[PDB]
Design an enzyme around this catalytic site. Structure first.
Site, PDB file in Angstrom:
ATOM      1  N   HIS A   1       0.818  -1.222   0.000  1.00  0.00           N
ATOM      2  CA  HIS A   1       0.000   0.000   0.000  1.00  0.00           C
ATOM      3  C   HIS A   1       0.846   1.263   0.000  1.00  0.00           C
ATOM      4  O   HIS A   1       0.851   2.035   0.962  1.00  0.00           O
ATOM      5  CB  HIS A   1      -0.988  -0.027   1.172  1.00  0.00           C
ATOM      6  CG  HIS A   1      -2.050  -1.064   1.014  1.00  0.00           C
ATOM      7  ND1 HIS A   1      -2.060  -2.241   1.733  1.00  0.00           N
ATOM      8  CD2 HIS A   1      -3.126  -1.117   0.195  1.00  0.00           C
ATOM      9  CE1 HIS A   1      -3.103  -2.965   1.368  1.00  0.00           C
ATOM     10  NE2 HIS A   1      -3.762  -2.309   0.434  1.00  0.00           N
TER      11      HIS A   1
ATOM     12  N   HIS B   1       1.442   1.217  -5.822  1.00  0.00           N
ATOM     13  CA  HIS B   1       0.059   0.739  -5.878  1.00  0.00           C
ATOM     14  C   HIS B   1      -0.878   1.872  -6.308  1.00  0.00           C
ATOM     15  O   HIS B   1      -1.760   1.666  -7.144  1.00  0.00           O
ATOM     16  CB  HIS B   1      -0.365   0.151  -4.519  1.00  0.00           C
ATOM     17  CG  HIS B   1      -1.833  -0.135  -4.400  1.00  0.00           C
ATOM     18  ND1 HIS B   1      -2.483  -1.060  -5.191  1.00  0.00           N
ATOM     19  CD2 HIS B   1      -2.772   0.372  -3.566  1.00  0.00           C
ATOM     20  CE1 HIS B   1      -3.762  -1.099  -4.855  1.00  0.00           C
ATOM     21  NE2 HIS B   1      -3.964  -0.242  -3.868  1.00  0.00           N
TER      22      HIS B   1
ATOM     23  N   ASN C   1      -4.713  -6.593  -9.769  1.00  0.00           N
ATOM     24  CA  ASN C   1      -3.423  -7.297  -9.837  1.00  0.00           C
ATOM     25  C   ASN C   1      -3.513  -8.689 -10.491  1.00  0.00           C
ATOM     26  O   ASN C   1      -2.686  -9.006 -11.349  1.00  0.00           O
ATOM     27  CB  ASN C   1      -2.740  -7.471  -8.467  1.00  0.00           C
ATOM     28  CG  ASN C   1      -2.456  -6.170  -7.732  1.00  0.00           C
ATOM     29  OD1 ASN C   1      -2.255  -6.203  -6.523  1.00  0.00           O
ATOM     30  ND2 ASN C   1      -2.401  -5.046  -8.438  1.00  0.00           N
TER      31      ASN C   1
ATOM     32  N   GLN D   1      -4.196 -17.320  -3.197  1.00  0.00           N
ATOM     33  CA  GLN D   1      -4.421 -16.575  -4.436  1.00  0.00           C
ATOM     34  C   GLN D   1      -5.567 -17.201  -5.232  1.00  0.00           C
ATOM     35  O   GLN D   1      -6.426 -16.490  -5.741  1.00  0.00           O
ATOM     36  CB  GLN D   1      -3.136 -16.484  -5.278  1.00  0.00           C
ATOM     37  CG  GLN D   1      -2.163 -15.401  -4.800  1.00  0.00           C
ATOM     38  CD  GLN D   1      -2.847 -14.094  -4.484  1.00  0.00           C
ATOM     39  OE1 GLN D   1      -3.436 -13.477  -5.358  1.00  0.00           O
ATOM     40  NE2 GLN D   1      -2.801 -13.681  -3.213  1.00  0.00           N
TER      41      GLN D   1
ATOM     42  N   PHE E   1      -8.748 -16.258  -3.465  1.00  0.00           N
ATOM     43  CA  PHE E   1      -9.103 -14.858  -3.627  1.00  0.00           C
ATOM     44  C   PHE E   1      -9.667 -14.622  -5.027  1.00  0.00           C
ATOM     45  O   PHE E   1     -10.627 -13.877  -5.183  1.00  0.00           O
ATOM     46  CB  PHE E   1      -7.912 -13.946  -3.341  1.00  0.00           C
ATOM     47  CG  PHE E   1      -8.296 -12.518  -3.079  1.00  0.00           C
ATOM     48  CD1 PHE E   1      -9.175 -12.195  -2.050  1.00  0.00           C
ATOM     49  CD2 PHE E   1      -7.784 -11.496  -3.862  1.00  0.00           C
ATOM     50  CE1 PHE E   1      -9.533 -10.875  -1.809  1.00  0.00           C
ATOM     51  CE2 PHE E   1      -8.140 -10.174  -3.625  1.00  0.00           C
ATOM     52  CZ  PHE E   1      -9.014  -9.865  -2.598  1.00  0.00           C
TER      53      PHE E   1
HETATM   54  C1  LIG Z   1      -1.839  -9.465  -5.236  1.00  0.00           C
HETATM   55  C2  LIG Z   1      -2.651 -10.317  -4.286  1.00  0.00           C
HETATM   56  O1  LIG Z   1      -3.461  -9.456  -3.464  1.00  0.00           O
HETATM   57  C3  LIG Z   1      -4.216 -10.050  -2.485  1.00  0.00           C
HETATM   58  O2  LIG Z   1      -4.136 -11.240  -2.188  1.00  0.00           O
HETATM   59  C4  LIG Z   1      -4.948  -9.089  -1.658  1.00  0.00           C
HETATM   60  C5  LIG Z   1      -5.912  -9.399  -0.653  1.00  0.00           C
HETATM   61  C6  LIG Z   1      -6.386 -10.741  -0.232  1.00  0.00           C
HETATM   62  N1  LIG Z   1      -6.410  -8.303  -0.068  1.00  0.00           N
HETATM   63  N2  LIG Z   1      -5.776  -7.295  -0.678  1.00  0.00           N
HETATM   64  C7  LIG Z   1      -4.892  -7.695  -1.640  1.00  0.00           C
HETATM   65  C8  LIG Z   1      -4.108  -6.697  -2.408  1.00  0.00           C
HETATM   66 MG   LIG Z   2      -7.533   0.813   0.424  1.00  0.00          MG
HETATM   67 ZN   LIG Z   3      -5.799   0.128  -2.784  1.00  0.00          ZN
END
Ligand SMILES: CCOC(=O)c1c(C)n[nH]c1C
Ligand SMILES: [Mg+2]
Ligand SMILES: [Zn+2]
Length: 326
Positions: free
Chosen positions: A75, A79, A236, A284, A287
């Site tokens: 962060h 970013h 991302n 990952q 997510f």
């Molecule tokens: C690049 C991978 O990002 C994440 O896993 C992630 C999560 C979970 N929360 N925020 C981010 C940026």
């Molecule tokens: Mg934020």
């Molecule tokens: Zn952000």
């Protein structure tokens, strides 16, 4: 110098998904947010449109960038620059051609630039659990996001930093409201509700014969801008794998540092923050499956078929990460 020439060449890809943002950060002396914002403002003719003096823009941008922490792995200013550039590309989607006004475009880009400013590298829940001054100030709701906004706007008051000095009072009021609405929407606790409303818009979608979205009222327009910047924030996993992997290394570093603070305080370690019990690849895939793909598939339906290449990359990356799991 050679460094300046290579930087200029890398910036020629500013309208493309997959910009070499880390290389730009290196070549610019850790000024990716300043150079990318300046490039985008010139590309969209925003300085002329809003009568922004160039020196004022650079002064504000450098000050804003200075308020991102250089010791926070994810962060940070890189970013912020990435979210800015990603929003810039999403605004140019053919399905959104001529949909948003110049003021709305300015609001989305500015919101993207300030959206994580002064981020301490820990989550809202950590700030609430540790009885932090930030959580006390903001009554436990959108703690970080309220703070990012307060700092982003407060910096406009510094010497030669008011980039909105030549906007009318009405324009300033409208831009401020839009920026607040957008940044507050980046709070992940609002993700499910935002996605539900985006899905509802896709089902009741109204378009021209060319496929351009027809958004008349503020509620629908801001909803699309909120989801757009939220998608940029969660972009991302949709970028070329080399970039995505670098972002993953960075967020894991930041998360592990939070988990180290939690472990020593005797707190329960937050999900993905325990360096001694981590499953980075599984996390990952999870997510992508539960958050990122549902969001991007819905965005893809809204602007069909303009986001197909982005969705394709996301699916390619999910497949690759899954293959690293035995
Ligand atoms: C690049 C991978 O990002 C994440 O896993 C992630 C999560 C979970 N929360 N925020 C981010 C940026
Ligand atoms: Mg934020
Ligand atoms: Zn952000």
């Amino acid at each position: 110098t050679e460094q300046e020439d290579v930087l200029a060449k890398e910036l020629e890809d500013v309208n493309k998904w997959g910009l070499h943002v880390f290389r730009i950060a290196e070549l610019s002396g850790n000024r990716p947010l300043t150079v990318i914002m300046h490039t985008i403002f010139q590309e969209r003719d925003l300085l002329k449109t809003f009568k922004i003096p160039v020196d004022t823009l650079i002064t504000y941008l450098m000050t804003l960038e200075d308020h991102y922490h250089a010791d926070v792995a994810y962060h940070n200013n890189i970013h912020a620059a990435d979210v800015v550039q990603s929003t810039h590309v999403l605004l140019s989607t053919p399905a959104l051609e001529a949909v948003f006004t110049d003021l709305e475009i300015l609001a989305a880009i500015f919101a993207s630039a300030i959206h994580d400013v002064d981020h301490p590298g820990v989550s809202n829940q950590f700030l609430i659990n540790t009885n932090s001054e930030l959580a006390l100030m903001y009554n436990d709701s959108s703690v970080l996001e309220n703070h990012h906004l307060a700092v982003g706007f407060k910096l406009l008051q510094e010497e030669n930093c008011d980039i909105f000095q030549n906007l009318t009072k009405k324009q300033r009021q409208s831009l401020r409201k839009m920026v607040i609405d957008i940044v507050l929407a980046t709070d992940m606790s609002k993700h499910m509700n935002l996605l539900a409303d985006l899905k509802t818009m896709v089902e009741t979608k109204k378009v021209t014969s060319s496929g351009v979205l027809l958004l008349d009222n503020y509620s629908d327009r801001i909803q699309v801008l909120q989801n757009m910047v939220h998608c940029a924030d969660l972009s991302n996993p949709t970028k070329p794998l080399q970039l995505y992997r670098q972002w993953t290394d960075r967020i894991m570093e930041e998360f592990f540092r939070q988990g180290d603070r939690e472990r020593e305080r005797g707190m329960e370690i937050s999900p993905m923050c325990d360096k001694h019990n981590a499953s980075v690849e599984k996390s990952q895939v999870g997510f992508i499956d539960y958050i990122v793909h549902p969001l991007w598939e819905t965005w893809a339906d809204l602007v069909h078929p303009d986001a197909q290449d982005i969705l394709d990359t996301l699916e390619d990356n999910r497949e690759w990460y899954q293959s690293t799991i035995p």
